[PDB]
Design a protein around this ligand. Sequence first.
Ligand SMILES: C[C@@H](CO)NC(=O)c1cnn2c(O)cc(-c3ccccc3)nc12
Ligand SMILES: [Zn+2]
Length: 347
Amino acid sequence: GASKLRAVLEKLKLSRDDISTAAGMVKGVVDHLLLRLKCDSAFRGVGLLNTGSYYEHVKISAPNEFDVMFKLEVPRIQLEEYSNTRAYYFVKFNPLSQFLEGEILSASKMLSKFRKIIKEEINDIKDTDVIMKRKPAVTLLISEKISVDITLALESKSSWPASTQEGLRIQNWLSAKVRKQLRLKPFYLVPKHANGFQEETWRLSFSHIEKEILNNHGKSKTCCENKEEKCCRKDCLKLMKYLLEQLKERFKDKKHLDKFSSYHVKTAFFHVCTQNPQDSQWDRKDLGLCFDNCVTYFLQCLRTEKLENYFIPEFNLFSSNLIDKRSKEFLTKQIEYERNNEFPVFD
Ligand SMILES: C[C@@H](CO)NC(=O)c1cnn2c(O)cc(-c3ccccc3)nc12
Ligand SMILES: [Zn+2]
């Protein structure tokens, strides 16, 4: 039974043109900010990253909400793992000399200059109306409709940290050949401090690898290139993403589902892909069964309080220290009700 599922997907597809026009306004403002950012010595090598839901063709439900990534190549860096977290690091070693708070690169001083240049540049541009929202680093508001979340990410062309060594288990699905090729690619560090936090740490980012894997997702190279080879991987992720967005909208005034994000859904999705490496396990005709495995796996993670980062196996996104048991039990209660009642939150 995939009828309501196929119905949702068609409706979601109709929002494509609206998302495309809105992206036009954003491309204008962003190209301008990058031209002005490149002027400062520190942000000279700044560029547009091209990762996210939109570039992975999985952008569901919000044309008035865009997330943009700004990469900045950093030359010869040394990482120091913070408090055995496996995901959070200190950036040690130059254009960024001004932001060194000891031998360590300050996330706060770095982001303040970034926010400062952006604040200075949005007043100077009169072509379109752009406002900057108060202290996903910098948030803009274009023409009073479009919100743009701007993230700064350091780029390192070094070997991936030791914590990733046993991650990205795509060998039996996408091949070891591909895994080797992917790990040769750079890695990113976004400033994330996650009583009181360490406001000088950087978290690992592999948004570019997630895009590569999603846009070349089959065991067969010709997956989704012909009628006989069409799969439902992307559709299951779109449906999982929409399921959480809809439930998070339904209970916005409650505050339980606040700690859950589309990243939890996407992570759980990649785990299901590792479990089901065959394209035959993802047949378009089996969408109902495939979406049910995704729902089922996600619920097992919520019950067992275990959702490991796809790249950092030792990092548990569903740890009791991150998300309290009552919140996971609320999300379980809601998802189970939905599955039992042919997904009323969809229509
Ligand atoms: C669930 C929240 C808060 O943990 N995260 C996100 O929403 C989130 C969105 N992209 N992304 C990502 O590219 C990487 C990570 C990540 C999380 C934990 C450990 C290492 C990396 N998270 C994200
Ligand atoms: Zn496919």
